[PDB]
Amino acid sequence: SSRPQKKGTAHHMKTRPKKTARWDIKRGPAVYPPLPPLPAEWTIVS
Amino acid sequence: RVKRGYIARRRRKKIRFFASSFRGAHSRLTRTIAQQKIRALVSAHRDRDRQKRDFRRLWITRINAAIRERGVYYNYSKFIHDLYKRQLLLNRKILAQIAILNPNCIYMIYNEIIK
Amino acid sequence: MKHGRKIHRLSRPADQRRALLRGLTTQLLKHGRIKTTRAKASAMRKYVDKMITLAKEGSLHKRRQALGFIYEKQIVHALFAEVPERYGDRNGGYTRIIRTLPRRGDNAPMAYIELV
Amino acid sequence: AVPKKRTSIYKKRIRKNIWKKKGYWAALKAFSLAKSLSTGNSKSFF
Amino acid sequence: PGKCDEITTRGYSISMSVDKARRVIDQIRGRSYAETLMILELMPYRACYPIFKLIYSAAANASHNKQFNKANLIISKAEVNKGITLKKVKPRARGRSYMIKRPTCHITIVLRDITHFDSYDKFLESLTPKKLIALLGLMSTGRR
Amino acid sequence: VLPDDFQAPEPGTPEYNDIINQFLPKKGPPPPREEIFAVVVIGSRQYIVIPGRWIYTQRLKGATVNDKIVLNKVLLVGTKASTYIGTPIVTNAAVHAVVEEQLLDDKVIVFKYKKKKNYRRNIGHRQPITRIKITGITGYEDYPAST
RNA sequence: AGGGUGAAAAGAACCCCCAUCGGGGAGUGAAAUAGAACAUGAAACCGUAAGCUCUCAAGCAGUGGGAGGGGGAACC
RNA sequence: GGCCAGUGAGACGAUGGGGGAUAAGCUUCAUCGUCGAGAGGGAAACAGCCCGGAUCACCAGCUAAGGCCCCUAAAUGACC
RNA sequence: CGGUAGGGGAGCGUUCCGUGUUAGGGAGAAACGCGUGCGUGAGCCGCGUUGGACGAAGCGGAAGCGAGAAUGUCGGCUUG
RNA sequence: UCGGAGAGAGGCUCGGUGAAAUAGACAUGUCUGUGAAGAUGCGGACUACCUGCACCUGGACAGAAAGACCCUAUGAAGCU
């Protein structure tokens, strides 16, 4: 004994998924080419 | 000035009818017919939003298999490097739908992507 | 466990079971037919056969045996003074257990004894 | 010693059915006794 | 409607438990009159006698009332139903008291004689439709 | 009373068989529409659409019934021997339409509540859909990528 | 605690099963599946018949997807 | 200011501390967060940790926290 | 535009009354169901049966006015 | 010690009459883990054809009596 144990909430901070590798923390999503705009989608003109 | 009621019987026949094919006391025994009713509506919500989420999942795995059919290491991952680099306006995981109906077409898609 | 014990006993205690067999055989030897539940039929079968053979040998001693078993006095005298003609050379196996419908009230299996 | 909770209709129908059916098996016996008691050689039923 | 191929013979509150009368009544469903007759005659069940008296008062109630045979005469449905039940207070130790009920059966038996137009072959001939209705007195798995 | 009995037909049934047979099985013909196949974009979502068909869509911006329409934002027009696949859209790909009655799709009971925390909300919702029919497809000739 | 057949008992002649309990015809009545433990008759609960289905199962038993089949020929 | 409420023993987490034995899912106060009164995804299950805030519909898409062998989505992807 | 305690706004429904010995009604008033008809919803229109007598709508009024929670309570029924 | 056999009445089976307390609904597995910190109802793994009858009582924090011990109430009552 002489060592406490880690309970609810307390247990969570020790043992939740952390992304502890500086690299993957850094990253950002792909961007893209700007994708020039798109036409209308509907027309009464018929 | 008695004011007695019958509006319960309708209040309650209505439910009594919405809980049909509930296979137990959940279909006869009014005082539980109520809470059952409540719980069917709730699972209607959760199963509805989860159905959007769930059909994405199903098409990801289905398109994923059609792409891996090429015997070389392709993916649903890398297929999308190459499907957005070449501007295709979002066939919306419904290329996963033709992938099972017009498979030759999906091989045409796939070859144009590889170029 | 029963294993080995072959004394057919009825629904009754010892004393009363004795009494039932003695009275019941008396009334058989009196009338010739009888109607008892099947179990009583078997238990009869043994003893009444004993009385018959006891009359097949009409010496005093045996006559006093039977005089001691059967209740009714004169059914004995009629019996041994009558049977060593009836059952001359029948030589064992004297009854017959022609059985019959159950007993409305218990659905108790009910049988119907003879002397033949 | 005291039951917790009433049984369903389901279970009870099962057991009542076993009761009655236990009566089912004990007819065809009586029907054999009948179909044999229709006049015939036999040593029973004086 | 059964069209006279049915002769209901309803029952009084015959003073016996519903469920036991139901084990014999379930016994006798479908069998032709002769069998169930000779069975209920010899059945070792108390609830068998009043059912018997009923049946025989249904055959005989269907021979001169309608006019049928008995050899071609089966027990079609033969249902039981509960009836009025009475309530007794029998007392018991430490001053408690318990209702002892007192049930009543309520039997309806629907015998069934046999009346047949008689059809020689399976083939159908979409003709005499008005007549056809009369012809199809009773059919199984009919379609169209 | 009395049984119905035989009646009086005494007539042998017609044995032509064939006339009766023509009468017995009903005719089936089903048309071929054509060999063409499109994927259009309405609202935000897409549809595999083939000429002559219903689609329950969102297009309730404004369009009365018994109408005619060009769903010009088309992509992946594919025939049944070749296909044309295009960047975002394939040019000149009118998928002509016939707008008709603007329904209210069936009720969807949204019903929310928590637990002991004592509330609940019986509310429903009709998404005003529009059931479009598709007449034909056009201008898919350019840049065919079919093979 | 126990109310409500019918407008009028017209409350059931006669027949059959029949320990005269209770029934099926016949008859009355507009109607008696209104027949005397009778006027509408809900729910719990007790059955019956038809349609589809459960015996390597795991579940507050529903829900979203729906295999297979039955229904009048896309809806249940 | 008017007319009117409910509330009055909160819990944990982070920090600075008292008491305790720098023991407690302990107790007591000060400044903040979540729960209380709040759903959803990660955490296997799991109020009080992380992202995040639920008007509804959508058999549309991009991401956050977290992840990509199978059960479950996604590289059994690259090189040190 | 989450939301318990709680506050405010807008409504439905039931028995009865005013408009009435109303409109309608023995070709047939209410309880059961087919209509995802209709409503955000409480509920409303239609639709049928052996029986079968009353009674809407609209604009208003009043309340013995809305129930699964009180080891409630009266009756009928089950489980064992 | 160290049990054993026996007779009777029950138990057991068949015919007849026929209760009870309890009971949210229960389609009512084991081990571990979790969780108001001792779950068939959650998670993972194992195990288990459906359903009877007899038999035992470890659980369902089993029934019984809104605990009788402890505390509180500006409760009641008795005695000094």
UniProtKB/Swiss-Prot annotation, chain A:
Subcellular location: Plastid, Chloroplast
Tree of life domain: Eukaryota
Subunit composition and interactions: Component of the chloroplast large ribosomal subunit (LSU). Mature 70S chloroplast ribosomes of higher plants consist of a small (30S) and a large (50S) subunit. The 30S small subunit contains 1 molecule of ribosomal RNA (16S rRNA) and 24 different proteins. The 50S large subunit contains 3 rRNA molecules (23S, 5S and 4.5S rRNA) and 33 different proteins.
Entry's family note: Belongs to the chloroplast-specific ribosomal protein cL38 family.
Summary of the function given for this chain in its UniProt record: Component of the chloroplast ribosome (chloro-ribosome), a dedicated translation machinery responsible for the synthesis of chloroplast genome-encoded proteins, including proteins of the transcription and translation machinery and components of the photosynthetic apparatus.
Protein name per the record: Large ribosomal subunit protein cL38
Species: Spinacia oleracea
Gene: PSRP6
Whole-protein coverage range: 48 to 93 of 116
UniProtKB/Swiss-Prot annotation, chain C:
UniProt keyword Ribosomal protein present: yes
GO terms assigned for molecular function: rRNA binding; structural constituent of ribosome
Chief location: plastid
One Pfam assignment: Ribosomal_L17
Biological process annotations from GO: translation
InterPro entries, alphabetized: Ribosomal_bL17 (IPR000456), Ribosomal_bL17_sf (IPR036373)
Subcellular location: Plastid, Chloroplast
Protein keywords: Chloroplast, Plastid, Ribonucleoprotein, Ribosomal protein, RNA-binding, rRNA-binding, Transit peptide
GO cellular component, one term: chloroplast
Keyword Plastid: yes
Top-level taxon: Eukaryota
Residue stretches spanning the membrane: none
Signal sequence region: none
NCBIfam families: L17
Assembly: Component of the chloroplast large ribosomal subunit (LSU). Mature 70S chloroplast ribosomes of higher plants consist of a small (30S) and a large (50S) subunit. The 30S small subunit contains 1 molecule of ribosomal RNA (16S rRNA) and 24 different proteins. The 50S large subunit contains 3 rRNA molecules (23S, 5S and 4.5S rRNA) and 33 different proteins.
Function: Component of the chloroplast ribosome (chloro-ribosome), a dedicated translation machinery responsible for the synthesis of chloroplast genome-encoded proteins, including proteins of the transcription and translation machinery and components of the photosynthetic apparatus.
Family: Belongs to the bacterial ribosomal protein bL17 family.
Name the record gives this protein: Large ribosomal subunit protein bL17c
UniProt source species: Spinacia oleracea (Spinach)
Lineage: Eukaryota, Viridiplantae, Streptophyta, Embryophyta, Tracheophyta
Curated annotation (Swiss-Prot), chain D:
Source organism per UniProt: Spinacia oleracea
Keyword Chloroplast carried by entry: yes
Protein name (Swiss-Prot/TrEMBL): Large ribosomal subunit protein bL32c
Role description: Component of the chloroplast ribosome (chloro-ribosome), a dedicated translation machinery responsible for the synthesis of chloroplast genome-encoded proteins, including proteins of the transcription and translation machinery and components of the photosynthetic apparatus.
GO molecular function term, any single one: structural constituent of ribosome
Residues of the full protein shown: 2 to 47 of 57
Subunit structure, interactors included: Component of the chloroplast large ribosomal subunit (LSU). Mature 70S chloroplast ribosomes of higher plants consist of a small (30S) and a large (50S) subunit. The 30S small subunit contains 1 molecule of ribosomal RNA (16S rRNA) and 24 different proteins. The 50S large subunit contains 3 rRNA molecules (23S, 5S and 4.5S rRNA) and 33 different proteins.
Higher taxonomy: Eukaryota, Viridiplantae, Streptophyta, Embryophyta, Tracheophyta
GO cellular component annotations of the record: chloroplast; large ribosomal subunit
Family classification: Belongs to the bacterial ribosomal protein bL32 family.
BP-aspect Gene Ontology terms: translation
Keywords: Chloroplast, Plastid, Ribonucleoprotein, Ribosomal protein
Gene: rpl32
Subcellular location: Plastid, Chloroplast
Curated annotation (Swiss-Prot), chain E:
Cellular component terms (Gene Ontology): chloroplast; large ribosomal subunit
Keyword hit for RNA-binding: yes
GO BP, one annotated term: translation
Keyword Lipid metabolism: no
Cellular localization per UniProt: Plastid, Chloroplast
Key words of the record: Chloroplast, Plastid, Ribonucleoprotein, Ribosomal protein, RNA-binding, rRNA-binding
Molecular function GO terms recorded: rRNA binding; structural constituent of ribosome
Quaternary assembly: Component of the chloroplast large ribosomal subunit (LSU). Mature 70S chloroplast ribosomes of higher plants consist of a small (30S) and a large (50S) subunit. The 30S small subunit contains 1 molecule of ribosomal RNA (16S rRNA) and 24 different proteins. The 50S large subunit contains 3 rRNA molecules (23S, 5S and 4.5S rRNA) and 33 different proteins. uL22c binds 5S rRNA in vitro; the central segment of the protein (approximately amino acids 30 to 124) but not the last 28 amino acids are required for this binding.
Functional note: Component of the chloroplast ribosome (chloro-ribosome), a dedicated translation machinery responsible for the synthesis of chloroplast genome-encoded proteins, including proteins of the transcription and translation machinery and components of the photosynthetic apparatus.
Family: Belongs to the universal ribosomal protein uL22 family.
UniProt-recorded name of the protein: Large ribosomal subunit protein uL22c
Underlying gene: rpl22
Residues of the full protein shown: 26 to 169 of 199
